[PDB]
Design a binder for this molecule. Structure first.
Ligand SMILES: Nc1ncnc2c1ncn2[C@@H]1O[C@H](COP(=O)(O)O)[C@@H](O)[C@H]1O
Ligand SMILES: Nc1ncnc2c1ncn2[C@@H]1O[C@H](COP(=O)(O)O)[C@@H](O)[C@H]1O
Ligand SMILES: [Cl-]
Ligand SMILES: [Cl-]
Lengths: 179, 179
């Protein structure tokens, strides 16, 4: 297409009634499949984070499983490591658990108790923000490790679901906004 | 440590009796957390694939969820796109299903029916090869899309579990070998 944002815009596809009726699933697979689109997405997020936080970011935290697609490249682009926040029963050793029952489903996440040392500054990444249940659970886990969450970011945001509100005062940034 | 392989070697940690008794879990999280280690791992895999297959690779296929950590960066390093092979119930639209009951668990995977066009050449990546049940299920799905699997690769291989044998004649390559 041309601009960096354009290359990301044109690589979302939509599937209605998935996983349940009335829900439009937004699939980032075309972004992964087109190496120009992927690079553009990582570049846009990286440039935002660098302009916004300077050199204050210690780690990116990627959310299982689609956040895992972006976290490592985003971290690498910023010269940083990536830590993992996982779905239930994935992680070995001591962990912290966050289990939220929400109106539309559950957000159940875990993190290794030694994933971060206290005072470390982190940016969370996932593919998509909807209600904010998931990212909110991630911020809870990180705060219980005494990490500071600088910002959460995603490729896609569903604005009618008020995810940004739920996360406030933690800053939020997305590339693309749909209803 | 120093050599590229060294930087990967020193970033595996082990947790015994997880997820079940007698099983040693090999955790690649330290690789992700140390940006030098991650870059070294991607570089080693990329250089092997480039030396081995020339320009014949069309896509990397990453396995959900830990293969997702490496697939995108490996693809990017080779100038290629990454396609996704997912656990059950993740993907929207038409899919192919592979469900294997194995002595020690199940390998249940899915791929979008349009993930690839017939004749496309693919390398599969995951964090770790054990029995080969998972990668074998992935190769089945790719073959049913009439894709050619050039090779499967991983960071870690558990050699006592004969994963390489199970995959043969599909070539296999790992960075690190444990019993
Ligand atoms: N409409 C959607 N399409 C694709 N993924 C979604 C959608 N809604 C929720 N998700 C996934 O669930 C999480 C965001 O939902 P939420 O916790 O409500 O913010 C992310 O991990 C998304 O990948
Ligand atoms: N001992 C292990 N430590 C970490 N992951 C494992 C281990 N064994 C199996 N896996 C995971 O399960 C898959 C490989 O098991 P297999 O299908 O038996 O080759 C990969 O997705 C691995 O991430
Ligand atoms: Cl995982
Ligand atoms: Cl997924």
């Amino acid at each position: 297409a041309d601009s960096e944002l354009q290359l990301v815009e044109q690589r979302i596809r939509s599937f209605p009634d998935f996983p349940t009726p009335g829900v439009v699933f937004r699939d980032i697979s075309p972004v992964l499949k087109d190496p120009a689109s992927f690079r553009a997405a990582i570049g846009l997020l990286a440039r935002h984070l660098k302009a916004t936080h300077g050199g204050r970011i210690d780690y990116i935290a990627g959310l299982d499983s689609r956040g895992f697609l972006f976290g490592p490249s985003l971290a690498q682009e910023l010269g940083l490591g990536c830590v993992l926040i996982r779905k239930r029963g994935k992680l070995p050793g001591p962990t912290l658990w966050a289990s939220y029952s929400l109106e539309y489903g559950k957000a159940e996440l875990e993190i290794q108790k030694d994933a971060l040392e206290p005072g470390q500054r982190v940016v969370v990444v996932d593919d998509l923000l909807a209600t904010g249940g998931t990212m909110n659970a991630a911020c809870e886990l990180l705060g219980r490790l005494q990490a500071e969450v600088l910002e959460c970011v995603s490729l896609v945001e569903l604005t009618s679901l008020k995810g940004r509100e739920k996360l406030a005062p933690v800053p939020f940034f997305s590339l693309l906004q749909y209803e």
